[PDB]
Amino acid sequence: RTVVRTFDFELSGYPDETFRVVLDSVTYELRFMWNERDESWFMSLGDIGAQRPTITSKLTCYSDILAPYRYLDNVPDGNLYLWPLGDIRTRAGRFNIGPLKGIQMTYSSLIE
Amino acid sequence: ENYGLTGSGFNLPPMDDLVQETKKTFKSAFGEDFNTESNSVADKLIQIFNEREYQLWLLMGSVYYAQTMQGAEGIYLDDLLGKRGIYRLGKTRSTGTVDYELSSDVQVDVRSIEPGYIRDVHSVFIDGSDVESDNEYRIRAATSISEGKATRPAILAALLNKVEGIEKVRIFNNNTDKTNSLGIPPYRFMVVCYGGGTAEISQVLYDTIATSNNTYGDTFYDITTQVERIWHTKAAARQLAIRVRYRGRPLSLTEETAIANGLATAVNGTMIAGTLYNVRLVGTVMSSTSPDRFTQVYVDIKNKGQPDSAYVNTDVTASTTQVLSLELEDVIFSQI
Amino acid sequence: LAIRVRYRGRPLSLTEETAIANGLATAVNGTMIAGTLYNVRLVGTVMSS
Amino acid sequence: LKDVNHIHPLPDFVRGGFDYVPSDIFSGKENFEQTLRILLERLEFIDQKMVELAELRTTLNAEDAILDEIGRQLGIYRNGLNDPEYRAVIMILTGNNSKSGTRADIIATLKQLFGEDGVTTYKGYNYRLDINIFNTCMEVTDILPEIIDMLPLVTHLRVVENQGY
């Protein structure tokens, strides 16, 4: 399953960010919510103007977020991962997500 | 204390009770002479807070139920079996033999161009396979996967994942000094499989057995890396027939299909050289349909082509190289 | 009624017979006069719980 | 310096919220406090049980009433096993999926069932292997079937159990 890096993300730290992104020539809308007690980011994925999000999950490092969901016509077939740029023991935080902040959220697409 | 997870199950308090002790404790702080009857201002306030609180209990119960095997539905089903490390399949493509395109270059096979469901008849191929539904998804979860080697579960796991066309497999062990009752030479073990190729399973076996070729079987195939050979066997060799007798309210036509197909699963799932128990067959009929439909039940088993007088109700087994199988044009229903 | 169960298999452990015992609670659901055990039903229940 | 597992009862839940009384306007009136305390303390119970709903579902502490559910997902049925050893078999079979049956490996799996010094293993020339038990805490006959499974395809095994050396 050859895959190539094709997109990177950044977060400003606002607890209720929402924006639209284009992946594999298809367009999706994303929502990020910050959880206080669990100090983690909650990601919701869905179609543009959809009544409810298609997928909701909790973000973690080195875990394949989309693994159990590559069976729907509206879910990207690529790979979405979070891995750190600094010390390997650093876990995902609020302000430490970005191309140079410490954590590299990235999307990669299979070659077809 | 009787609320929440308790080992015996999960208990949810109804709406009414939560009000009762809330008023009771609330009354305790101000004495009996404190109006709390219907439509009273104090009662109205209590109801609002308890209703908001009650949703919390309901949410907790739903979360617990959503994660149990019985209550798994839709996406929630995917997450639960996802925890095991396996995921449902997607749009699958047909395979043919010399809309379609060649699978690879050829010289002195066939692959479908379309992404999914699909020009599929002899003398004009695997059709269908659009989305892998929950029912078969539950079935596919019955298997197991591991990276182990040299151990009995490891051998079984690898074969069912790598050998194409494999459907069943079993292993017999003779770890003693003298030949067993099955004639296996001492300090050797035998592998019997149903379906699959011959020069491929050997390759798979070589990569997963210990560095001591203890295989034994009917047929061999040499391999090299130094040269050695691996043994195995093939069983197939049985088809059954079934009749059922019952007393009560006839089962129309739809139920017989529900009863008949259900039985085919239990018989088919039997292990190689296994045994069928008449009691188990009865139990399936009592569970593939709603209870309270029969007063008596009997099942009779015979091999295809045998005379009707050959029907028997005793338990039946199979030889070492036999596999039990059942199909349609079978399962003769009747009313006593 | 007094009911005795006999079987062939692995020995059942204590506190595992509770499910079977409570499973036979269906025997208390018979109707007046028109109550027939249909022991086949009992066999099904004991093999279900 | 901090625990990674954030699922814990909220420390001093009750005094919080009371901290949101604006300027001690009501404090010391003993009529509003009781009304607020009675309502808040109800959340205490619910907040506490939120943990056990997650803590108790782990295989380490799961009680038999629900441990069966965990085993059911893995295909390991209770059969006649009792709670203390039913936990053991679940661990043993699950751990078998990443094993190779080496001498060092076999010692590791037996290590979890008999303490540090409770087990030893002799080896023989012609496929002979021996297992020795010194400090068993559970009945072994019911555990025996698994002890065979994680061994090479051609092992020849003896089992002897005793208390102490």
XYZ file of C-alpha atoms in Angstrom:
662
model
C 0.000 0.000 0.000
C 2.246 2.785 -1.275
C 1.250 6.204 0.071
C 2.568 9.735 -0.476
C 2.347 12.736 1.835
C 0.007 15.329 0.340
C -1.355 17.627 3.086
C -0.544 19.049 6.518
C -2.676 20.738 9.176
C -2.264 23.469 11.783
C -4.402 24.543 14.732
C -4.549 27.992 16.306
C -5.639 26.592 19.676
C -9.135 28.066 19.653
C -11.357 25.508 21.434
C -14.085 25.388 18.742
C -12.278 25.740 15.412
C -14.185 24.777 12.264
C -12.967 25.007 8.675
C -13.251 23.376 5.263
C -10.488 21.335 3.617
C -10.044 19.614 0.254
C -8.519 16.130 0.086
C -8.150 13.794 -2.904
C -10.061 16.401 -4.978
C -13.055 15.964 -2.624
C -14.109 18.581 -0.061
C -14.910 18.017 3.613
C -15.639 20.125 6.684
C -13.841 19.531 9.983
C -14.624 20.494 13.578
C -12.151 20.436 16.473
C -13.288 20.635 20.105
C -10.966 20.855 23.109
C -11.765 18.713 26.156
C -10.663 20.117 29.515
C -10.723 17.076 31.799
C -9.224 14.749 29.169
C -6.934 17.449 27.684
C -7.399 16.093 24.155
C -8.743 17.197 20.784
C -12.044 15.806 19.498
C -12.343 15.704 15.705
C -15.598 15.485 13.749
C -15.695 14.823 10.007
C -18.590 15.167 7.605
C -19.808 16.384 4.245
C -20.328 20.048 3.420
C -23.638 21.248 4.824
C -24.390 17.838 6.321
C -26.935 17.687 9.127
C -24.659 15.566 11.341
C -20.979 14.586 11.158
C -20.143 11.236 9.606
C -17.221 10.384 11.917
C -16.180 11.500 15.391
C -13.015 10.338 17.127
C -10.363 11.335 19.654
C -6.918 12.323 18.399
C -3.840 10.432 19.585
C -0.253 10.005 18.437
C 0.792 7.160 16.117
C -2.785 5.823 15.883
C -4.512 5.294 12.532
C -7.622 7.424 12.998
C -9.440 6.326 9.828
C -8.560 2.615 10.089
C -12.038 1.270 10.981
C -13.862 3.651 8.607
C -12.503 2.937 5.110
C -15.808 1.410 4.006
C -17.920 4.538 3.333
C -18.233 6.480 0.082
C -17.654 9.822 1.864
C -14.529 8.993 3.916
C -10.981 9.539 2.578
C -9.060 6.376 1.749
C -5.683 7.856 2.720
C -3.841 7.797 6.052
C -4.212 10.354 8.851
C -1.590 10.331 11.607
C -0.150 12.522 14.337
C 3.549 12.104 15.097
C 5.954 14.431 16.911
C 8.898 16.380 15.554
C 10.686 16.670 18.910
C 11.164 14.106 21.644
C 9.154 10.973 20.902
C 7.549 10.967 24.366
C 5.646 14.237 23.841
C 1.881 13.743 23.656
C -0.588 15.869 21.715
C -1.394 19.166 23.410
C -3.431 22.295 22.739
C -0.904 24.745 21.289
C 1.765 22.225 20.225
C 0.084 21.152 16.951
C 1.552 22.425 13.698
C 4.400 22.073 11.198
C 6.892 23.520 13.710
C 5.051 23.598 17.063
C 6.043 20.027 17.959
C 3.325 17.760 16.545
C 2.848 17.166 12.814
C -0.724 16.315 11.874
C -0.522 14.983 8.334
C -2.602 13.328 5.622
C -1.173 10.992 2.990
C -2.873 9.497 -0.058
C -2.398 6.127 -1.727
C -0.979 6.127 -5.251
C -3.902 5.709 -7.656
C -25.668 1.760 45.894
C -27.962 -0.367 43.722
C -27.327 1.906 40.716
C -24.793 1.626 37.917
C -22.501 -1.244 37.059
C -22.893 -4.035 39.611
C -21.274 -7.159 38.138
C -24.639 -8.851 37.725
C -25.505 -6.216 35.117
C -26.388 -2.553 34.782
C -29.225 -0.963 36.756
C -30.991 2.247 35.760
C -33.219 4.158 38.203
C -36.608 5.279 36.856
C -37.745 8.907 36.836
C -40.056 8.612 39.836
C -37.626 7.254 42.429
C -34.950 9.931 41.982
C -37.549 12.502 43.021
C -38.507 10.451 46.068
C -35.199 10.483 47.942
C -34.354 13.980 46.697
C -37.503 15.228 48.411
C -36.844 12.986 51.414
C -33.327 14.294 52.014
C -34.490 17.796 51.120
C -37.293 17.421 53.662
C -34.813 16.187 56.272
C -33.092 19.586 56.280
C -36.284 21.503 57.121
C -38.673 19.100 58.877
C -41.952 17.517 57.888
C -43.934 20.780 57.911
C -42.628 21.797 54.496
C -44.987 21.891 51.531
C -43.810 19.640 48.698
C -47.140 18.628 47.164
C -48.097 18.824 43.499
C -47.809 22.182 41.730
C -46.030 23.670 44.738
C -43.217 26.054 43.856
C -40.643 23.878 45.624
C -41.818 20.730 43.842
C -41.729 22.477 40.465
C -38.091 23.420 41.033
C -37.132 19.892 42.096
C -38.630 18.360 38.954
C -36.557 20.554 36.633
C -33.230 19.598 38.207
C -33.998 15.880 38.468
C -35.071 15.692 34.819
C -31.786 17.285 33.774
C -29.966 14.858 36.075
C -31.946 11.858 34.839
C -30.546 12.202 31.317
C -27.100 11.505 32.768
C -28.175 8.054 33.952
C -29.829 7.323 30.609
C -26.691 8.403 28.750
C -24.534 6.112 30.888
C -26.810 3.146 30.239
C -26.761 3.796 26.501
C -22.957 3.984 26.472
C -22.640 0.645 28.265
C -25.217 -1.018 26.025
C -23.713 0.496 22.879
C -20.374 -1.197 23.618
C -21.710 -4.698 24.306
C -21.721 -7.322 21.569
C -25.506 -7.708 21.598
C -26.189 -3.981 21.226
C -23.573 -3.305 18.535
C -25.160 -1.570 15.539
C -23.870 0.348 12.544
C -20.729 2.363 13.191
C -20.678 1.291 16.838
C -20.266 -2.274 15.584
C -17.220 -1.200 13.578
C -15.552 0.305 16.645
C -16.034 -2.782 18.823
C -14.577 -5.274 16.351
C -12.078 -2.596 15.374
C -10.688 -2.924 18.890
C -9.701 -6.460 17.848
C -7.616 -5.074 14.974
C -9.865 -6.004 12.024
C -12.041 -3.820 9.809
C -14.941 -4.365 7.436
C -14.210 -4.823 3.748
C -15.087 -2.428 0.939
C -15.947 -2.435 -2.741
C -14.484 -5.693 -4.067
C -13.623 -6.530 -7.670
C -14.246 -9.583 -9.836
C -11.575 -11.984 -11.109
C -11.856 -13.871 -14.394
C -9.849 -15.999 -16.826
C -8.836 -15.686 -20.475
C -15.763 -3.488 -18.321
C -12.808 -5.811 -17.705
C -9.054 -5.602 -18.179
C -6.076 -7.935 -18.001
C -4.574 -8.292 -14.529
C -0.979 -8.453 -15.805
C 1.064 -8.779 -18.971
C 0.880 -12.114 -20.794
C 2.988 -13.956 -23.352
C 3.326 -17.304 -25.102
C -5.082 -12.942 -15.701
C -8.334 -10.955 -15.904
C -9.372 -8.119 -13.606
C -12.537 -6.055 -13.484
C -12.271 -2.361 -14.297
C -15.360 -1.384 -12.329
C -14.871 -0.821 -8.586
C -17.525 -3.258 -7.397
C -20.768 -5.132 -8.049
C -20.940 -6.626 -11.537
C -20.951 -10.206 -18.526
C -20.532 -12.884 -15.870
C -21.686 -16.121 -17.526
C -19.951 -19.101 -19.092
C -19.035 -18.872 -22.777
C -20.084 -15.274 -23.440
C -15.589 -14.507 -12.505
C -16.621 -13.524 -8.970
C -19.631 -11.224 -8.768
C -21.203 -9.071 -6.088
C -19.120 -8.078 -3.072
C -20.149 -4.421 -2.818
C -20.196 -3.843 0.962
C -19.471 -6.327 3.713
C -22.587 -6.318 5.866
C -22.778 -6.709 9.633
C -24.088 -10.275 9.722
C -21.161 -11.695 7.764
C -18.963 -9.091 9.465
C -19.796 -10.738 12.781
C -19.022 -14.103 11.186
C -15.657 -12.965 9.835
C -14.740 -11.814 13.349
C -14.927 -15.433 14.543
C -11.412 -16.034 13.207
C -8.225 -15.117 15.054
C -4.939 -13.528 14.012
C -1.514 -13.636 15.630
C 2.160 -13.325 14.734
C 3.170 -16.461 16.637
C 4.962 -19.424 15.108
C 5.681 -23.088 15.791
C 2.515 -23.463 17.869
C -0.813 -25.071 16.973
C -2.891 -21.840 16.971
C -0.184 -20.127 14.912
C -0.315 -22.770 12.175
C -4.098 -22.512 11.974
C -4.071 -18.711 11.955
C -1.509 -18.371 9.171
C -3.180 -20.894 6.865
C -6.597 -19.231 7.048
C -5.047 -15.855 6.139
C -2.472 -16.693 3.443
C -3.533 -19.882 1.638
C -6.042 -18.834 -1.007
C -9.253 -20.825 -1.198
C -8.834 -22.421 2.232
C -12.115 -23.158 4.019
C -11.312 -25.516 6.909
C -8.278 -27.031 8.610
C -7.408 -29.244 11.563
C -4.235 -30.693 13.062
C -3.661 -34.022 14.798
C -0.744 -34.521 17.172
C 1.237 -37.609 18.172
C 3.839 -36.402 20.684
C 4.749 -39.828 22.105
C 7.263 -42.616 21.592
C 5.015 -45.133 19.812
C 2.555 -44.862 16.944
C -0.844 -43.537 17.985
C -4.250 -45.054 17.240
C -4.237 -43.069 13.981
C -0.992 -44.626 12.752
C 1.016 -41.392 12.968
C 4.746 -42.189 13.257
C 6.163 -41.264 16.669
C 7.315 -37.675 17.177
C 5.434 -36.398 14.136
C 2.212 -34.517 13.467
C -0.249 -34.485 10.578
C -2.086 -31.575 8.948
C -5.360 -32.080 7.072
C -7.016 -29.299 5.088
C -10.039 -28.830 2.852
C -9.705 -26.861 -0.354
C -6.715 -24.747 -1.270
C -3.704 -25.481 -3.454
C -0.817 -27.901 -2.948
C 2.401 -26.039 -3.822
C 1.357 -22.953 -1.847
C 0.278 -24.284 1.541
C 3.656 -26.019 1.661
C 5.314 -22.638 1.151
C 3.169 -21.134 3.906
C 3.826 -24.068 6.237
C 7.584 -23.832 5.714
C 7.641 -20.225 6.932
C 5.738 -21.066 10.122
C 6.820 -24.529 11.360
C 9.830 -25.035 13.609
C 13.254 -25.945 12.219
C 12.421 -29.642 12.458
C 10.336 -31.055 9.611
C 7.929 -33.157 11.667
C 5.200 -33.190 9.020
C 3.484 -36.364 7.849
C 0.674 -36.996 5.415
C -0.503 -38.565 2.192
C 1.137 -36.246 -0.338
C 4.410 -34.330 -0.364
C 5.926 -31.410 -2.246
C 9.609 -30.500 -2.182
C 10.795 -26.962 -1.447
C 14.223 -25.345 -1.260
C 15.970 -22.273 0.108
C 19.054 -27.079 0.782
C 15.888 -29.010 -0.100
C 13.102 -30.597 1.945
C 9.459 -31.616 1.556
C 6.202 -31.048 3.444
C 3.233 -33.389 3.858
C -0.523 -32.797 4.021
C -3.895 -34.386 3.258
C -7.319 -33.537 1.817
C -10.639 -34.822 3.125
C -13.843 -33.458 1.457
C -15.923 -36.637 0.914
C -19.379 -36.267 2.490
C -22.812 -34.729 1.948
C -25.722 -35.246 4.327
C -29.522 -35.180 4.251
C -31.973 -34.188 6.974
C -35.649 -34.617 7.815
C -37.624 -32.924 10.591
C -40.908 -33.945 12.233
C -42.980 -31.716 14.513
C -46.435 -31.349 16.057
C -48.373 -28.097 16.182
C -49.107 -25.048 14.039
C -47.700 -25.444 10.500
C -44.811 -23.119 9.690
C -46.121 -21.625 6.428
C -43.237 -21.384 3.941
C -41.080 -18.500 5.152
C -40.252 -20.098 8.508
C -39.041 -23.335 6.912
C -36.512 -21.211 5.038
C -35.555 -19.574 8.335
C -35.352 -22.989 9.999
C -33.641 -24.702 7.067
C -30.892 -22.152 6.437
C -30.195 -21.879 10.160
C -29.561 -25.609 10.412
C -27.153 -25.484 7.469
C -24.888 -23.156 9.456
C -24.592 -25.407 12.508
C -23.949 -28.579 10.503
C -21.489 -26.822 8.204
C -19.471 -25.278 11.034
C -18.578 -28.702 12.419
C -14.879 -29.488 12.664
C -13.027 -31.998 10.521
C -13.760 -35.511 11.775
C -16.214 -34.011 14.247
C -19.481 -35.313 15.649
C -23.065 -34.087 15.358
C -25.306 -34.255 18.427
C -29.028 -34.733 17.886
C -29.733 -32.567 20.934
C -27.823 -29.623 19.457
C -29.817 -29.831 16.223
C -33.065 -29.651 18.194
C -31.810 -26.634 20.118
C -31.185 -24.696 16.912
C -34.783 -25.181 15.757
C -36.043 -23.912 19.117
C -33.842 -20.806 18.703
C -34.068 -19.999 14.966
C -37.740 -19.211 15.530
C -39.842 -17.896 18.382
C -40.532 -20.428 21.166
C -44.005 -21.819 21.845
C -44.566 -23.207 18.343
C -43.943 -26.941 18.837
C -44.846 -29.619 21.364
C -42.557 -32.335 19.959
C -39.598 -32.336 17.581
C -37.377 -34.946 15.958
C -34.608 -34.826 13.365
C -33.371 -37.620 11.109
C -30.052 -37.746 9.254
C -28.991 -39.789 6.236
C -26.494 -39.554 3.403
C -27.670 -38.474 -0.039
C -29.118 -41.214 -2.230
C -29.752 -43.586 0.651
C -33.187 -45.206 0.957
C -35.740 -43.450 3.133
C -35.544 -46.370 5.571
C -31.965 -45.301 6.376
C -33.077 -42.263 8.403
C -31.584 -42.364 11.907
C -31.738 -40.086 14.944
C -28.517 -41.162 16.668
C -25.488 -38.889 16.735
C -23.249 -39.132 13.675
C -19.515 -38.621 13.262
C -17.070 -38.610 10.348
C -13.808 -40.335 9.522
C -10.435 -38.607 9.598
C -10.654 -37.584 5.926
C -14.355 -36.621 5.836
C -16.057 -33.230 6.121
C -19.753 -32.822 6.912
C -21.776 -30.729 4.472
C -25.426 -29.819 3.960
C -27.336 -28.010 1.225
C -30.842 -27.358 -0.105
C -33.120 -29.894 -1.788
C -32.947 -31.222 1.765
C -34.622 -30.748 5.145
C -37.922 -32.568 4.625
C -40.536 -30.900 6.811
C -43.567 -32.859 7.973
C -46.352 -32.835 10.553
C -46.826 -35.912 12.721
C -42.871 -30.011 40.918
C -39.492 -31.652 41.464
C -37.103 -31.576 38.505
C -33.900 -33.563 37.980
C -31.382 -32.761 35.236
C -28.828 -35.228 33.876
C -26.275 -34.584 31.157
C -22.937 -35.600 29.659
C -20.139 -33.052 29.473
C -17.800 -30.991 31.595
C -18.851 -30.711 35.271
C -20.812 -27.545 35.980
C -19.297 -25.337 38.668
C -21.082 -23.839 41.656
C -22.837 -20.520 40.959
C -22.989 -21.542 37.287
C -26.158 -23.548 37.943
C -27.935 -20.339 38.974
C -28.620 -19.431 35.345
C -30.126 -22.857 34.661
C -32.210 -22.791 37.843
C -33.614 -19.332 37.123
C -33.957 -20.353 33.478
C -36.600 -22.884 34.514
C -38.667 -19.957 35.808
C -40.669 -20.445 32.602
C -42.239 -23.447 34.343
C -44.070 -20.910 36.539
C -45.721 -19.355 33.458
C -48.109 -22.216 32.714
C -51.776 -21.322 32.448
C -54.573 -22.793 34.536
C -55.723 -26.222 33.353
C -54.230 -25.602 29.899
C -50.680 -25.935 31.158
C -48.449 -28.482 29.432
C -44.729 -28.541 30.135
C -43.614 -29.706 26.675
C -40.343 -31.013 28.065
C -38.781 -30.221 24.685
C -39.273 -26.574 25.638
C -37.432 -27.200 28.911
C -34.573 -28.851 27.017
C -34.393 -25.799 24.780
C -34.374 -23.390 27.716
C -31.697 -25.243 29.683
C -29.525 -25.234 26.543
C -30.195 -21.507 25.994
C -29.401 -19.759 29.298
C 5.132 14.363 37.587
C 1.527 13.877 36.466
C -0.576 10.806 35.788
C -1.395 10.202 32.135
C -4.774 8.639 32.991
C -7.106 11.602 33.488
C -10.097 9.433 34.466
C -10.228 10.089 38.214
C -12.820 11.438 40.653
C -12.726 15.211 40.558
C -10.770 16.403 43.624
C -12.849 18.453 46.071
C -15.846 18.577 43.719
C -18.222 19.942 46.370
C -16.286 23.045 47.439
C -16.049 23.993 43.788
C -19.122 25.768 42.515
C -19.570 27.173 45.997
C -16.498 29.175 44.974
C -18.745 30.794 42.349
C -20.981 32.492 44.928
C -20.206 36.088 43.886
C -19.187 38.049 46.993
C -20.209 35.943 50.014
C -23.645 37.577 49.703
C -25.441 34.372 50.686
C -22.660 32.711 52.686
C -23.524 32.397 56.356
C -27.272 32.394 55.726
C -27.654 28.613 56.289
C -30.811 28.605 54.150
C -29.439 28.930 50.611
C -26.371 26.795 51.323
C -28.370 23.708 52.276
C -30.533 24.012 49.167
C -27.448 24.275 46.957
C -25.522 21.583 48.835
C -28.388 19.094 48.569
C -28.493 19.467 44.781
C -24.732 19.463 44.204
C -24.069 16.440 46.416
C -26.304 14.384 44.114
C -23.809 14.934 41.296
C -21.114 13.622 43.648
C -22.616 10.136 43.531
C -23.039 10.202 39.749
C -19.539 11.626 39.294
C -18.083 8.826 41.410
C -19.870 6.039 39.518
C -18.620 7.418 36.191
C -15.224 5.923 37.049
C -16.309 2.402 38.003
C -18.268 2.280 34.747
C -14.823 2.495 33.105
C -12.519 1.137 35.820
C -14.478 -2.051 36.505
C -14.812 -2.955 32.812
C -11.069 -3.633 32.520
C -10.120 -7.305 32.396
C -7.882 -7.008 35.469
C -10.740 -6.080 37.825
C -13.801 -7.249 35.863
C -16.135 -9.344 38.007
C -17.390 -12.710 36.771
C -20.863 -11.327 36.022
C -19.363 -9.174 33.243
C -15.992 -10.874 32.702
C -17.979 -13.405 30.678
C -18.811 -10.586 28.262
C -15.108 -9.836 27.799
C -14.356 -13.519 27.278
C -17.302 -13.904 24.919
C -15.870 -11.338 22.502
C -12.633 -13.363 22.408
C -14.299 -16.774 22.079
C -13.055 -17.981 25.489
C -16.150 -19.430 27.127
C -16.427 -20.023 30.864
C -17.117 -23.771 30.591
C -16.603 -24.979 34.192
C -13.922 -22.474 35.201
C -14.318 -20.318 38.301
C -13.607 -16.605 38.561
C -10.015 -16.582 39.919
C -8.660 -18.909 37.230
C -11.049 -17.844 34.461
C -9.094 -14.592 34.543
C -5.863 -16.554 34.119
C -6.970 -18.515 31.051
C -8.128 -15.302 29.372
C -4.670 -13.803 29.863
C -2.855 -16.967 28.770
C -4.736 -17.480 25.506
C -4.556 -13.802 24.554
C -0.821 -13.703 25.234
C -0.294 -16.732 23.000
C -0.905 -14.679 19.838
C 2.589 -13.107 19.921
C 4.675 -16.100 20.991
C 7.180 -18.523 19.512
C 7.539 -21.198 22.215
C 11.205 -20.573 22.966
C 12.800 -21.614 26.246
C 13.128 -17.999 27.366
C 9.600 -17.297 26.136
C 8.004 -20.247 27.945
C 9.526 -19.159 31.258
C 7.958 -15.722 30.845
C 4.388 -17.010 30.496
C 4.716 -19.390 33.448
C 6.140 -16.470 35.427
C 2.726 -14.793 35.742
C 1.102 -17.894 37.283
C 3.590 -18.980 39.972
C 5.474 -15.908 41.181
C 9.213 -15.503 40.709
C 10.648 -18.744 42.115
C 7.572 -20.963 41.861
C 8.473 -22.605 38.536
C 11.470 -24.249 36.877
C 11.953 -26.151 33.615
C 14.263 -29.047 32.782
C 15.136 -29.942 29.194
C 15.882 -33.279 27.558
C 17.748 -34.532 24.501
C 14.906 -36.139 22.510
C 12.193 -33.467 22.593
C 11.709 -34.014 26.332
C 10.656 -31.021 28.422
C 9.686 -30.879 32.093
C 7.713 -28.357 34.153
C 8.102 -27.982 37.922
C 5.708 -26.067 40.184
C 6.474 -24.937 43.734
C 3.956 -22.248 44.746
C 0.722 -22.891 42.857
C -2.161 -20.684 43.990
C -4.843 -22.264 41.773
C -5.903 -25.769 40.815
C -3.859 -26.796 37.792
C -5.833 -29.562 36.059
C -8.291 -27.078 34.551
C -5.439 -24.792 33.457
C -3.493 -27.703 31.959
C -5.093 -27.692 28.467
C -3.691 -24.237 27.717
C -0.231 -25.093 29.080
C 0.049 -27.523 26.156
C -1.056 -25.035 23.513
C 1.916 -22.638 23.712
C 4.505 -25.380 23.127
C 6.121 -26.495 19.850
C 4.244 -28.924 17.624
C 6.391 -31.875 18.735
C 6.990 -31.273 22.449
C 7.092 -34.166 24.913
C 5.953 -32.858 28.278
C 5.838 -33.941 31.907
C 4.016 -32.023 34.640
C 4.810 -32.331 38.345
C 3.474 -30.057 41.074
C 4.494 -29.757 44.716
C 4.462 -27.182 47.510
C 7.864 -25.652 48.199
C 11.182 -27.059 47.003
